[PDB]
Each structure stands twice: as structure tokens, then as C-alpha cells.
């Protein structure tokens, strides 16, 4: 299995499934297929709703053979009001219920800002007391590394300073038309891993089908898919848009976590390890030079730990 060694020893699988797209019900045939095709990695959180459907498909798994519990790596994330005072234990410890699992292999803050249940209330909780808590169930053995999402380079270094558990990954939304470079400079000089989600950017095809469901010519629309020097690659690599764009964030140092649920695309993404990109290749796909932010999480905005606040 491709892995990334993380800080503390352990080996995170470079390629994952991202599940922020699945229900309950797509969640157990997707995880299935990933797993029969060589994924190693599951990526979840309690928002999403589906860790009980995860666990499920997992159950099948370890019953018919597929697999065994060490062969897979399971991350899951905390919520907003997970990540408040006193809160993430017991968080954590439904996720592993809803999951059936004993451990999780990566335990994530899914964001940096604190809310109440219904999120119509800001918790000013310093990310500072938000990573004590991460470092608590850390040492209690219930996740084998901790981590975050979204948060920018000030929250993370101040987290690495109060001199506990450090940061073993940061999953944010990167692929080639939002390069993150500067977060990913950060995190190397910190021994930090990089996931990647959003790895397929924007939308790259319209649809047209008639009422009878007849299926029509589709049109390219503008991203990361359909860029000029991605398209020149993938013709001359004889491989898909996608894969040049998955290969990219791999080859930038990065793991990644493709969304895709359909079984012929879960089978397609996985395809990217007959080939590599140079640091020449790599600096073409970046010469269109376009950056734009699309998960601007929002929600976030006006609360003390607003990741992004200054974009708003």
C-alpha cells in the first residue's frame, strides 16, 4: 500500500475515499468497491452522517475476507460542537460506536471554530484548548494520529507551540487551480502531512438530457478539468484529465481523497500509479496561474477562529 509516513511512525495511504458525498446507502457499495480495488483509506466525519453505514460496510468486509482492521486506515472528524470544552471525548467516542471500531487510525478537528448544537451560537474556544482535547484522546490510545481541516498556517503553528501531541496532518481543499503552496511549505517545514480534498476542482462538464432521459452531447465548462495544459498532459500520458489532476496533488506531496462514488470512477481514480510528473510538468499545468478558493466554508465567518477570515 502507497503510504505517507506520518510523524509519530505511522503510514497513512496516499489515496483515499472521500465520503462528504455519500449517503448512507451509496456509502456501502462505494466503500466496498474502493476496498476491493486496492483504496486503504476511508475518510468520514460524524457531520456527514454516515460513520453507522461505514461501519457496516466494513463489518461485510472483515467477514468475507476482503481485508483485516490493520490493513485499513480510517479517519474520521469532529464537528463544531464536538470541538467544544470537554466535548471531543465523548465525540469521538459515538464516531467509534457509529463505526464499530475500537480505534480510529486519524482523529481530525473538522474545522477550527467551536458552535453550539444548533450552530446559532459562537464558542470562543482558542484552538489552543481545542488541540488539548485532540492531544487527550491521543494519548488515550482511542485515535493512532490527530490532526486538522481547514485551518490556516497562524492556528496550526499555534497549536504546535503549547509543545503536546503534534499536528500529524492537515486536510484542506487543493487541486490545480488552488495550488495552496504556501500552506504546503508550512506544513513541510513542520513534518506535517498534507491531504488533499476537492482533489477534481470545479465541475468540468455540463449535461444535457431530455425530459425522455435521453442522454445528449455534454459541453466542457470552465476548470481545473478542462485546462489547456491538463488536457495536452493527459493526451500525451494516454490517461484522464482526472488522473493528471490526482497525480498532480500526489506529486506535489500530498495525499488525496477523490469524491467520486460511482463504481467506473472509484476504478478510475485509483488507475494513477503507472506514471509520475516531473517538476517541469508540474510547473506547466501551473502556468494558467488561476487560484480561487471554492469551499469558502462560511459559516465560519464573524466567529473569533474564522480560518479564513481575512478573505471575507
Known sequence: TASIKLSNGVEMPVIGLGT????????????KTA???GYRLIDTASVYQNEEAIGTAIKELLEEGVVKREELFITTKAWTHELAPGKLEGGLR???????LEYVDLYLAHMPAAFNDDMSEHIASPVEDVWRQFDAV???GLAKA???SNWNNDQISRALALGLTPVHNSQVELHLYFPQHDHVDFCKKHNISVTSYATLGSPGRVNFTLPTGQKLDWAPAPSDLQDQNVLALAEKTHKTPAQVLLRYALDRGCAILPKSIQENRIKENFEVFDFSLTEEDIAKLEESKNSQRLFLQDFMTGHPEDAFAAER
Do not use: D, H
Not at 462528504?20 to 466503500?31: D, L, N
Not at 459515538?94 to 464499530?100: R, T, Y
Open 20 to 31: 462528504w458525498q455519500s449517503s448512507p446507502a451509496e456509502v456501502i457499495t462505494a466503500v
Open 35 to 37: 476496498v476491493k480495488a
Open 94 to 100: 459515538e464516531s467509534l460506536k457509529k463505526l464499530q
Open 138 to 140: 491521543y494519548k488515550a
Open 146 to 148: 490527530v490532526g486538522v
